[PDB]
Amino acid sequence: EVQLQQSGAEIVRSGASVKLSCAASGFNIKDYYMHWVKQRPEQGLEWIGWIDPENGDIAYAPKFQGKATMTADTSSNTAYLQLSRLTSEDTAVYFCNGRGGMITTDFFDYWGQGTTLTVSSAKTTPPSVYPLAPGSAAQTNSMVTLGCLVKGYFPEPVTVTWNSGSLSSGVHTFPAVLQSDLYTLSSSVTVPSSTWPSETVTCNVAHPASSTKVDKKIVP
Amino acid sequence: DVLMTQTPLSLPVSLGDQASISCRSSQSIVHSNGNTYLEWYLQKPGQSPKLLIYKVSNRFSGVPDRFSGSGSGTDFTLKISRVEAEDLGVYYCFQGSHVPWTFGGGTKLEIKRADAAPTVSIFPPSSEQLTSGGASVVCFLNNFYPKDINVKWKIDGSERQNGVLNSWTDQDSKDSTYSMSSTLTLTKDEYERHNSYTCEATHKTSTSPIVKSFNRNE
Amino acid sequence: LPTPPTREPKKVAVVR
Ligand code: NA
Ligand code: NA
Ligand code: NA
Ligand code: NA
């Protein structure tokens, strides 16, 4: 229950600025030093800076001097990270970490859940959803694998279900990748070959940013 | 910046076994004040890092005694005795002695299981996609172990390497397998120019590639 | 007396 709660995902254009927040509940940030950390899948974890919220002392990693501005508001028990002059290399998940509450030798260490920042000038775009069925010269085994291709959407995420949730085992949905400044993913489902195409299989794709829901029937 | 390097990159282990992960700094991370601020974190998929060890060898609250940290100067180790399922994830070392503080690149602790060959399925572009002038050919390589795999696309028997995008699942929490998708994206004109499309998977489970193919004219 | 950043936990007074 006691936690640091970070603000929600942000999509922002290059050259803009954003201010991320991290709010404590169950403890007083005056009793903690706060740290911000950046994470990307390929470049990994990077330390951004440190702040003492009580008196405003601050220190930044060299690479974030001018990029990052850390502040805190003890009255609202919140720490903030502002990022300026945004570019694609700022697209990351940002974590806050509080360390403190030390009376003698014991201490508390809390992490926020992370805030995703996406820096892009792409427009909100619903996915095109396409059925994936095996070739017409493909002999059904014991099991058959079907799929759905979800192409050209922005921003993340989409959700994919099969038969409106009734088909849950044997399902994989792969992570999205960028293709032409939009996202693409596929989902696969495996069912007994006796059950398809005699019983129907449908993928259900939802894209909340565009309020889009689409159902695509998989046919031979 | 002081560079933190971890080995191995990936450590397959069976539950109950021991694991040891090394962390080396490019120079000493003893702080002016005599302390060595070497920390270890575990990060599980979708979660934040969680502190395991601080100042080289001190277990954070709630961290079981099967985790132990050691080392000095530029060379450090995290040892996990009797690995449990809850220990699986990515381990990072971290130095907070010299600004900028830096993280290691991570070591993935992963569960072993029996070798498993991928199930390979190839999917021609849907009629719907051909309508709009695109053509994506999809190959699924499902439920294989170990994670090391190579995928090759061939168009009329010749390898194609541009316009291919791959995506991997995390190790499955139920059966400990991996899965992969490979998508070849062509113009409709390029697609209609050739007849044979093949996805070939090379996995340690056989010297022979698994080949799945279709012909556009069928 | 400049104040550097630290990995030490912040200290708090006793809670009676
Ligand atoms: Na932009
Ligand atoms: Na082992
Ligand atoms: Na050739
Ligand atoms: Na790729």
Q: How far is C5 from chain A (nearest CA, A)?
A: 6
Structural domain containing residue A32: 1-121
Q: Which of A87, A121, A155 is the last residue of a domain?
A: A121
Of A6, A35, A36, give the one whose Cα is nearest residue A21: A6
Say if the Cβ atoms of B140 and A145 lie within 8 Å: yes
Query: Which ligand is closest to the CA of A90, given by its number?
Result: 1
Say if the Cβ atoms of B54 and C4 lie within 8 Å: no
Q: Which of A121, A137, A171 is the last residue of a domain?
A: A121
Q: How far is B166 from chain A (nearest CA, A)?
A: 8
The residue of chain B nearest to residue C9, with distances taken between CA atoms, is: B54
d(CA B12, CA A16): 43
Data resolution in angstroms: 1.6
Same domain for A33 and A91?
A: yes
Measured between beta carbons, the chain A residues lying within 8 angstroms of C1 are none
CA-angle at B174, arms to A129 and B172, nearest 5°: 50
- Structural domain count of chain A: 2
Q: Which of A67, A100, A121 is the last residue of a domain?
A: A121
Residue A94 φ then ψ, to 5°? -110, 130
Q: How far is A174 from chain B (nearest CA, A)?
A: 6
Is the Cβ–Cβ distance between A10 and A17 less than 8 Å? Answer: no
Same domain for A131 and A157?
A: yes
The verdict on B96 touching C (C-beta cutoff 8 Å) is: yes
The residue of chain C nearest to residue B100, with distances taken between CA atoms, is: C5
This entry's atomic model was obtained through: X-ray
d(CA A49, CA A36): 6
d(CA B21, CA C13): 38
Of B140, B122, B125, give the one whose Cα is nearest residue B186: B125
Q: Which of C3, C6, C7 to mutate to test the interface with B (most CBs of B within 10 A)?
A: C7
Same domain for A10 and A114?
A: yes
d(CA A215, CA A202): 6
Task: Please compute Rg for chain B using Cα positions.
Answer: 23
* Cα B56 versus chain centre, distance: 27
When CB atoms are compared, the residue of B99, B106, B169 closest to A59 is B99
How many CB pairs lie under 8 A apart between chains B and C? Answer: 9
